[PDB]
């Protein structure tokens, strides 16, 4: 009925905000570019999604052999695990803020709690989606209010000139850069769209002029990604206007935002706590939906590469568990350190953006053969190659 959808994923949340607590308005440009890129990529897969009656996974299978198949399957599994780790940490932090339970108990609750999603499914969709949409929209209103006196030409002229010296030299910059990119693309979204397009009442083969569906779907996808771009830009400039030009250059993870909202002077006293807990709720809900979307993606991947299948609850459970193991390892090793956990989170995102090319290459290749093809694949070519140079340099400086 009414509009309801969740666009903020803790990955992009932390990455964008961090990018505004440390370096300022510099990163802004990168965001745009990444967003634009994803648009194009969506387009591509959707074309592949609608013709050739296959899924990107099946595609990969039809250009490989058994072993390298195992390899790319490992890679896709690792991408999914990365996203799930991001999510579970998001949920754990949300719980620790709202209630007070320590992190380990929250992590365990999250991992073996998927029964909530069968319960609430038996409960009713429209209401829950409406209410979460309301709360997210309101949280975003709050952030907008919170942004204050600012100098536009700064943001602008830093968006534009793209100080390459800057964007490449600070190897702290490449880090959050790759973070933003790999959190704006999210390969699991690629596989999932490739599959989901396969069902829109197009006359599967008996309409050579089904491309009307292509145009409609691409329009939808572009609208979606555009609004995601606006949200990311907002979060970044928020981190900027709330932590920049200061002493000790506090990192700017989640906790710091949660406090800065509370102790915020001009917001009175109680309103601090009000917005605080609202933010907490938002974090939690975003985590959960980001989980639920990717289960189908994992299923599709395994069905494609190994040509095997499992019921969903087993899939979700085992993935979540193998995801939560690194969380607990890091917690016990580092005895609990918000700084250390948020650092793990960002490293997860950047690892996602490292894995991307192994799933980007075959997409381009396959769209170079069949009946429908892009005229200027050259954009994707330059994209992947510049990409490879960046990732290998960031690897090297280690």
């Amino acid at each position: 009925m009414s509009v309801a959808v969740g666009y903020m994923d803790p990955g992009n949340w932390i990455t964008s905000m961090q990018g505004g607590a440390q370096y300022g308005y510099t990163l802004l440009f990168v965001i745009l570019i990444s967003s634009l890129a994803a648009m194009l990529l969506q387009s591509m897969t959707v074309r592949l999604g609608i013709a050739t009656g296959k899924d990107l996974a099946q595609m990969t299978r039809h250009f490989l052999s058994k072993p390298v198949a195992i390899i790319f399957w490992i890679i896709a599994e690792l991408a999914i695990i990365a996203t799930d780790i991001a999510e579970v940490i998001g949920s754990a932090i949300a719980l620790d803020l709202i209630f007070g339970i320590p992190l380990i108990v929250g992590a365990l609750i999250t991992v073996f709690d998927v029964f909530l999603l069968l319960f609430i499914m038996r409960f009713g969709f429209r209401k829950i989606e409406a209410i979460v949409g309301t709360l997210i929209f309101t949280v975003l209103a709050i952030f907008v209010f919170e942004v204050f006196i600012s100098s536009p030409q700064l943001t602008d002229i830093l968006n534009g000139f793209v100080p390459h010296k800057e964007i490449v030299t600070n190897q702290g910059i490449l880090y959050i850069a790759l973070g933003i990119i790999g959190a704006t693309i999210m390969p699991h979204n690629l596989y999932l769209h490739s599959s989901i397009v396969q069902s829109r009442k197009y006359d599967r083969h008996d309409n050579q002029e089904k491309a009307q569906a292509i145009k409609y779907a691409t329009i939808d996808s572009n609208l979606q990604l555009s609004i995601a771009f606006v949200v990311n830009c907002l979060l970044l400039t928020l981190g900027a206007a709330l932590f920049f030009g200061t002493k000790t250059n506090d990192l700017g993870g989640f906790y710091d935002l949660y406090h800065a909202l509370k102790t915020e002077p001009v917001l009175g006293a109680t309103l601090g706590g009000i917005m605080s807990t609202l933010f907490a709720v938002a974090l939690l809900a975003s985590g959960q939906n980001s989980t639920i979307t990717g289960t189908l993606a994992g299923q599709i991947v395994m069905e494609g590469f190994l040509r095997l299948s499992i019921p969903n609850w087993l899939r979700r459970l085992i993935t979540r568990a193998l995801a939560v193991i690194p969380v607990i390892i890091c917690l016990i090793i580092f005895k609990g350190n918000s700084e250390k956990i948020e650092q793990l989170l960002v490293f997860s995102q950047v690892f996602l953006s490292i894995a991307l090319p192994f799933s980007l290459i075959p997409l381009q290749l396959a769209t170079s053969n069949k009946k429908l093809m892009g005229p200027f694949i050259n954009k994707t070519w330059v994209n992947i190659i510049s990409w490879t140079l960046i990732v290998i340099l960031s690897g090297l400086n280690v």
Partner: nanobody
Amino acid sequence: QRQLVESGGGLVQPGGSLRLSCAASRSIFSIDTAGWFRQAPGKEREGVATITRDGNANYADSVKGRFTISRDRARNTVYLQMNSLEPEDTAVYYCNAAIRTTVRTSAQEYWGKGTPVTVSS
């Protein structure tokens, strides 16, 4: 120097354990650097531990093995868990801090009032 409130001291047999908790009075943004001092009744204010901005947990040279400082970045509260206590650790345990009220105001010191801790049969 007020607006900090330690709490948790109490009688304890030799070899017991307990967790003192420096705190804040109202809605404090962050605790830069803590420190727990001791002022046993016939000596000078010694000093027992020191966390830093991120984490350093530097200790004294007579306590490593029993005292585990920590922080709680969620509800700003330094902790101090003493384990396997001894009859030579009786004293009042002050708390130091480096409170910073809001995200842009400079730092500012603060001392506590401290709490007693007795160890005996």
